[PDB]
């Protein structure tokens, strides 16, 4: 019976909530109240990359912390040399509605995807001279929102059809399918060991999936609206999610519950992108008020404000060595702060 | 549908049988990790121009 | 090294000139979004002009227009609709005849949501009302009534500036003008000058849709320029 | 233009005043 | 966790009155615009009524305009729908829906299937 | 004494050497021709009439003589015969007008400098429109600077020396003055062409139009002033070229300005027609039925940016109503550069929004 199943699910939810309540004896804020604040954080726009024609949605730093990739609505995927500001590559796209991009850890490939429901893979290291389309993925029934490279052969993608897909590049087929979300999955983050990944959808919940097992392990429901950003802590034990309710929230995999909420009264605009510093002390979040906020991840204190962008901030990334932070916005410019 | 409710119940059963460590322990672990790698965090403190590739 | 630096500079300048040419091409073309229901009959409209997203390229008076359809996307459109905020216009398709569900009310709610969106406040909407012949024949038959869905239709009065087509009885003209006035009220509720609505009456056999869209786009761009010079 | 007209008029007036004063001194 | 619970539905004779209650939890009720929608048997989801955050802006569909009333109580974090002069065509499953984002005048895809911020609904038979 | 007096000086030489070099009727004639301050005389016999003529110095008041010879010499023309040739027949006004447009130009220069700085310090206000506006402001800068330099050289320095001055520097200053003025007028025309082109050629928005507009706006004044300078040097090199005695030469530089003014008036009329066509739409426009009122707010917003006030006296001749023309076009028009700076920079909605955003962020 449907009613019996609903009652059983409700009882299970009550049991899980009671277990979480019993497992929570102290809050992170009062435990961290004894440490000194990081103080005011001042960052200047060290670099300003120009050349895109339309708004930029996504960017991804390279493992060398020097080359980055950006995707814009003009059908352009531009690979930038951050050190010298010179453009390294400019790949035209068949579909101009790109909404995500990824850069391979080896640096030989880049990923693309958008409203075409296609996750194209471009090979940078071509013997014939310039970048050409390498692989085509045509399995998702919804728009691609995020994609990340596990290696040169396996990729993970999130789509608007409430499902995630683990693809094998050579075969071009869905090696694994992750289902369970009830809303459009907007972002995914890869754990440092590349064994687990967290995905946030438009249902105020974040789901943790095992790459090898292909099944959902934990579900976190603390947000009030759609989650637009997600990112692990530097260690594979916590992750931060920014939502449309103008709040960011920190969740611990082991605790399986909320840790800390970053929000302010004057902030009434949703968060588009979040990221952590190298040590995880600073949490950088891009907002819809044309500004980015750097919070203290341990004290929920607004450490700094970056206000260089004149339009909505769409993407934000931190280098592997944590030297600089790059912000892309709905204007035509990328910014690099240090 | 009945299938969706059954799948939700199965997922809840799978998620309810895992073990959860104390929240204080997780907070202490996060603090220890933050304070262990604080020195090697160029964003936490200003970096000299000599060691800064951008400037 | 100096050699690698100069090679990088040469590659950068080649990319820059290619991007300049592509910028000229991009500014030459005008992008439009197309939106409507399944029963709204936008397929015949596309055929009049003429996968994840469908692209249609057409040249009018040596001006290139790129129309983008909804494609294979779910009904939840609160996320991907933000992409089409810089487009020249959003074409909205409404089946005016629609008798299973109150599709007209759903279309009105969708139009209100699009109009009131914060990211679509600067985007103009061109409204098209199809199934004009179906509405006319269902009004003539009298078996289907609009007063049940809209009780204020009984008290509605045909505007004095209405220009009904020849050979058309006043009943269908009044019904279609009330339907249009609903959208006019929704559009005039908010957004006084940021963006404008351009309703039109069209049928499955009409061929003036191209010229109407061209003229509406020209008017939209002219109004955008005047607003920039604060002349309105 | 207006500036040129004013400059020409002022220069002519100054020249005429100089001629008047010189002629008055002479005559 | 955001959740909406609907109650008060039941069998009512034609021309009667009914009261539908929506209890909200997991979010700030006063920061969102609330909606009432219905699904008739063998029919798709359709919007019925909506009420703004403060209750100043209230709108109804034309089918039930002049017979249905919608109100909200932010102190009790609840929503009420008063039904008068009910008709057999009103027999449906009624759902209480929340706008996806707060402080937004627009409200997208509340009548979409598998909406994340919609309650289980209650059956009303006339 | 002065150069002008020194002018008559060479008559005292010119005849005498001419009397000594090629010779005359007598070495010591009874009526020796000797220079006079009324006219440059020539020697003749005794008892005859000498029909000399006074120089152009007498012919300075309108836009286009003899003495008896005796044994002693010349005879004084008692019955007013000395002034027979020519000589048929404002300081406060000129000083007041000078101070007026000097104050206006100073105010416009200060306001436009503030506007240019506040526009340059922001990157969100970078567009072709704002670029065209910036060039109009540069044109105003150069016009005001040229006005100040010409006033200091031609008149302020003249009082210091109290004598005639004629050097290459003053001619170069006048050429720079003319170039700046013509550049300002031309850029008022360009402002109109760009908006009419936007409002008319709605599609095909190529940026080649802006490049051509900049080229023509900075090139045509240069060509005009080079032609004028060559004509002055080759035909009428008198003084510091501050007097437009020659009609054709002055018209050479006046014609482009008048043509620019007329074409800018025509484009303004076309823009007004397009705007009233747009405002008469039933749905998009209206909502008050007092559309003319809104139209009024547009008209006053376009007159300073196009120089429509120059059309009032463009057709009128220079001599007719010269004082009123100088008061209106120059005395009151010198604030035009200020006015646009208030209208198109300080009162701009996006500029004010950027200012408030920057202030709240700092």
Numbering used by the authors:
A (entry chain B): 3 to 340
B (entry chain G): 8 to 62
C (entry chain A): 12 to 61, 205 to 252, 261 to 394
D (entry chain P): 1 to 27
E (entry chain N): 1 to 126
F (entry chain R): 24 to 87, 114 to 138, 146 to 418
Quote from the publication.
The pituitary adenylate cyclase-activating polypeptide (PACAP) receptor subfamily consists of three class B1 G protein-coupled receptors (GPCRs) that have diverse physiological functions, including modulation of inflammatory and neuroprotective signalling pathways. In contrast, the VIP/PACAP receptors 1 (VPAC1R) and 2 (VPAC2R) have high affinity for both PACAP and VIP and are activated with high potency by both peptides. Here we present cryo-EM structures and conformational variance analysis of VIP-VPAC1R-Gs, PACAP27-VPAC1R-Gs and PACAP27-PAC1R-Gs complexes. A hallmark of class B1 GPCRs is a relatively large N-terminal extracellular domain (ECD) of ~150 amino acids that is the site of initial binding of the C-termini of peptide agonists, and this facilitates subsequent engagement of the peptide N-terminal activation domain with the extracellular loops (ECLs) and transmembrane helices (TMs) of the receptor core.
For this study, PAC1R refers to the PAC1Rnull variant. The datasets containing complexes with PACAP27 (VPAC1R-Gs and PAC1R-Gs), were each refined to global resolutions of 2.3 Å or 2.4 Å (tight and wide mask, respectively), and the receptor alone refinement reached 2.5 Å. VIP and PACAP27 bound to VPAC1R are angled towards TM1/TM2 as they exit the receptor core, whereas PACAP27 bound to PAC1R exits the core in a vertically aligned orientation (~6 Å/~8 degrees relative to PACAP27-VPAC1R). These distinctions in peptide orientation are aligned with the tilt position of the ECDs where helix 1 (H1ECD) of the PAC1R ECD is tilted back (~18 Å/~35 degrees), relative to H1ECD of VPAC1R that is oriented closer to perpendicular to the membrane plane. PAC1R also displayed a shorter TM1 helix (~one turn), with poorly resolved map density for the stalk region that links TM1 and the ECD, compared to the VPAC1R structures. In the VPAC1R structures, the H-bond interaction between S2PACAP/VIP and E7.42 had the highest frequency (>90%), however, the equivalent interaction was less persistent in the PACAP27-PAC1R structure (S2PACAP -E7.42; 5.4% occupancy). In the PAC1R structure, D3PACAP exhibited high occupancy H-bond interactions with both R2.60PAC1R (92.4%) and Y1.47PAC1R (56.3%), whereas in VPAC1R structures, only R2.60VPAC1R interactions with D3PACAP (73.8%) or D3VIP (43%) were observed. Differences were observed in water molecule networks in the vicinity of S2 and D3 of the PAC1R vs VPAC1R, where the S2PACAP27 side chain penetrates deeper into the PAC1R TM bundle, relative to VPAC1R where it occupies the position of a water molecule that is present in the VPAC1R binding pocket. Nonetheless, in all of our cryo-EM maps there is close proximity of a pair of cysteines, in H1ECD and ECL1 (C25ECD-C219ECL1 for PAC1R, and C37ECD-C208ECL1 for VPAC1R), with the clearest density observed in the cryo-EM map for the PACAP27-PAC1R-Gs complex.
